[PDB]
Design a binder for this molecule. Structure first.
Ligand SMILES: [Ca+2]
Ligand SMILES: [Ca+2]
Ligand SMILES: [Ca+2]
Ligand SMILES: [Ca+2]
Ligand SMILES: [Ca+2]
Ligand SMILES: [Ca+2]
Ligand SMILES: [Ca+2]
Ligand SMILES: [Ca+2]
Ligand SMILES: [Ca+2]
Ligand SMILES: [Ca+2]
Ligand SMILES: [Ca+2]
Ligand SMILES: [Ca+2]
Ligand SMILES: [Ca+2]
Ligand SMILES: [Ca+2]
Lengths: 206, 206, 206, 206, 206, 206, 206
């Protein structure tokens, strides 16, 4: 339990050893989730990179937020991927947010408070519970096989993961700075560990 | 009666089975009408899609709001259509509303509160009374013949239909959120039914 | 001419020298009028005060919006007054405004968008054209005889006056913030002058 | 005499029969004039069209406000014309107003409150009095010879014509909506006549 | 320098020894100021207490935010006091903020984002620079003479003092949690000192 | 002596007879000056033109503000000129202001309140005392030799000439409208003379 | 000691004699530093130029803020250089400044308050103490060898050097105008010396 308020992780150089793991105290399978966070990187025009990696035993790409080169964010559940295209690119800390529900397959997506159209992905799926979370590397296995081309170089922080779908009002509250309380991955009581060259510095985004 | 406030229908996948019907129990022909509604989709740059379909026995496209690819909205009365060109495209929940009158043929059109140039269409026509309304599919018959290419993928809600022409002040009130009361198709007294995969979710637009 | 958008006048102390005059370039008698404006003061529980004063040569109280103590607003035309009772009092920027017509004498009244019952006052009257408008003081003459007990201490702004009756839709538009264009006293082209301790400050009400 | 406040003419289709006449009660030659009017059309990118036509006996193009294709408005007095070039085009109700003075030849021009550079045209001219005004058609004779390609399709209203030069303050007052009093062509006491399919509808512009 | 984010001071018992001093690095006299701060106490119904005390050499009550028993907050400048009455009392962390300008004497007041009417106080005054700030005690001298009856028992934090007047939008951002940067008394770089039984604990208000 | 406030000169046609002369009552040579004024023309996309011409006996181009075509303003002192690049052009009344000091050669330049980079020109020069000022024509001699291609067509006014370097805050007050008092060429006490077609009209810029 | 508030240095011409020297009273090696300053020049589109030059005995390019042509600013430490590209260019007084720490090699970058992505540079380096600072010239030796092509022509001022890393809040305070106190190079007690044609003039940026 460590309060990471106003602090964010820093990935200055690309390497297959700089990464952090996150421990989820949840012991029940997931029927719905909502995981989003802040990040600031410059690789949005040079090569692809991962943002949030959630890999389990039977699947190395259970939940993976990946940024496709010249397309945009590529969200995926269980292995099937959907594309959220963007015709332009900016240089600023982006705060995207997405949700998912197995009961209806709706996949919401937000970009800096602006919402995107809902899509279907893995209707009736069942996300596991015992899994490993890696921020900065796209693991192709349960805790390893990091891709140098898919690695992340920049800043990252304010990770929050729920176990249900958040209303638009709750998403606006998260984007603005209002009070909240996660139940799966709390940024105020995160239980993480540092591996490689991962330094903690104050956040740049307000 | 079912109150659909703050809720909207969602269409994540294109299909000829995902659609809803709207009951119009009015037993009097229509000499004028006005319908405003919200919609949020990204198909404005890939292929055409339908928005509002009002089909009767003698005509499948009595009142039909269609989005033509690379031109814009294509409103039609009785079968003859007019074009409202838009040189650019945006990514945001758009709120359109149009009017029509048989006594003068004037066809108004509003896009997010901004008015468009008036046009003449079907002077002296007589819209029927008994009809079927379908949101998301272009029905080429009385309750069937849905086109997969003309289907809709996105969100839709707050559909309200009157039986006369609304003043510009009334249209501004509708766009802002002020009080109102439709007399043909009320979003607060909608009598609808679910067919296919059509779920109710909170609206994204404020 | 001076654009007074987002700005309002302030009266911090009660005095017979702090007041502002408003020049109406109209040269035609008025058979109907409608003026709406904002005001925020705390004198609603200690003593009476004036809000909108419109005095002419033959009558010092042609159009005068006064707040009577322990009853409410006291609107008057030509000298005859009517009472709009309020059993309670609030502490917030209140937006009230009324209308009047000589053809029928109907006097509407609105309080923060909520309408009041219509009343009759001065059926067949003829409001003069050459007159002086004073905001903050109850003038008992053509530009003088200011009452210290009836003076105003607080804020005032967004004064807009028409020469006809506004529909409920236009009233709701004014209350919400939609576009409009006054034709008697425009807040965007107000031709006023400062006298006494009257400072310009940003408005508190949204 | 008919009050045309908040109402405007509608030209939905192009034709040589759709036009309106305006009766000027002035019986004295004109040494200066100023006309402001609203108009909302979509023909600003397809073909030219007329806005204000003032033709007399000895000249069919005494005063003619014409919109040239791909350049802009082409104002003219007596027969000699000058060009007010616009490098871009918009889609919104535009409010133009221009002035002229025979004593100095100065030709002012305003576009939505923004002024244009002054120019000279017909120094020492003398505009006649007995003439016919046509809104929507470019007449090539005294009350006839309407051009099909030079027709107007859209809305028009709030036409006011003075007999002198208006100060920039008065022009801003007109643009914002403030009080005024014409003496040659009053929109509040217009004496007009209808011909063809010309319907009166509430204005779209605020 | 010490960052006091998410932390607040605690005054559990009334004593003439428990207080905190604040060092202002400003060496220029003040013509305007604005102090927003949080506080949560229960003495709002038992006896009076001080909130913000700013005393100098020539005046022991230069700037003093005091809560009068059964009346409300009693703001004062230089020695002249003004009353902001409130007929109701609540038990919750209240966020008040006030401003002042020597050029106009206007003194604003905000209570949990809700604004109060503006008043005049000490027009043309000049607040000194070399002074001592004490939170929790009403000092009757330059660093002493604390009143046990006027002492404070509760929590206080997030004190921020500017050197000018804040706009309503800035006050709204302060109350909500938006970014800001003080120039006289920064809660993120407070240079304070502890005295007596004053412990730092996480804040209760969100 | 005459007040030229709120009025500006008008040049409707290009001619070698339209110009205005200004008498400077100063009988001492100039070591520094500051000259700025308002102007509104459309020639900035067709051909070059002069703005402010200050010619003396020994030099026809002592101080001359010229607008080069496809580059921008070309300031000069004594005969040596410099270039101020503007990669774009606008259609609006532009208010530039520049200064110069012989003791350091520094020449400043402002554009509608926005400042430009500092440069050096004629270090140690000595501007003469007796001269003729011509607005609208580029004189190649002491009161003659006007170039038709370098003439000015548009409006001009607000001419002010100091005899030293003005501070940035003074430039800001000049651009906004604050009080000032020239000592060489006052717009409130200008002693000018008319020649050609030069009419006085109210200014368009606020 | 000299207070250089509201004043800035001016380099009007490129030359090998115009430069300013800065004396650092620090006698301890630097493990972290932070330089912030203002600058306004027009050479950002013609050729490269230096901004901040910090050369030592064993290294002529220890700390050098250089603007590379058609890419952007090129910060370097010890000899290794990293490029901060900018796809566009502006004409305005720009305020950029960076930080650095040898403990982890993290290097920040801010552009008018907007932060840039963090990078690694010279992990474990040790910046010397006895060095010479030159503003306007890129010294290739300890106090000489200035490049004419790399010289600076424009304005510069408000130079402040710390000996640690500044928080984002402190950076925002510096950018806004709040108080601060350097410990190695204070703009309020700068110990400099003039050489060549370097004149002091009031700053243009607010
Ligand atoms: Ca994988
Ligand atoms: Ca991989
Ligand atoms: Ca059909
Ligand atoms: Ca079909
Ligand atoms: Ca009276
Ligand atoms: Ca009285
Ligand atoms: Ca003709
Ligand atoms: Ca023709
Ligand atoms: Ca005291
Ligand atoms: Ca006491
Ligand atoms: Ca010459
Ligand atoms: Ca020449
Ligand atoms: Ca070097
Ligand atoms: Ca070099």
């Amino acid at each position: 339990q460590t309060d990471m308020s106003r602090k964010a992780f820093v990935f200055p150089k690309e390497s297959d050893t700089s990464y952090v793991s996150l421990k989820a105290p949840l012991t029940k399978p997931l029927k719905a989730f909502t995981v989003c966070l802040h990040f600031y990187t410059e690789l949005s025009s040079t090569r692809g990179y991962s943002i949030f990696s959630y890999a389990t035993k039977r699947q190395d790409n259970e939940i993976l937020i990946f940024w496709s080169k010249d397309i945009g964010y590529s969200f995926t559940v269980g292995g099937s991927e959907i594309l959220f295209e963007v015709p332009e690119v900016t240089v600023a800390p982006v705060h995207i947010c997405t949700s998912w529900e197995s009961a209806s397959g709706i996949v919401e997506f937000w970009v800096d408070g602006k919402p995107r159209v809902r899509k279907s992905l893995k209707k009736g799926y069942t996300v596991g519970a015992e899994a490993s979370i890696i921020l900065g590397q796209e693991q192709d296995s349960f805790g390893g096989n990091f891709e140098g081309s898919q690695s992340l170089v920049g800043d990252i922080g304010n990770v929050n993961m729920w176990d249900f779908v958040l209303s638009p009002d709750e998403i606006n509250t998260i984007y603005l700075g209002g009070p909240f309380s996660p139940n799966v991955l709390n940024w105020r009581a995160l239980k993480y560990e540092v591996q490689g060259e991962v330094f903690t510095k104050p956040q740049l985004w307000p």
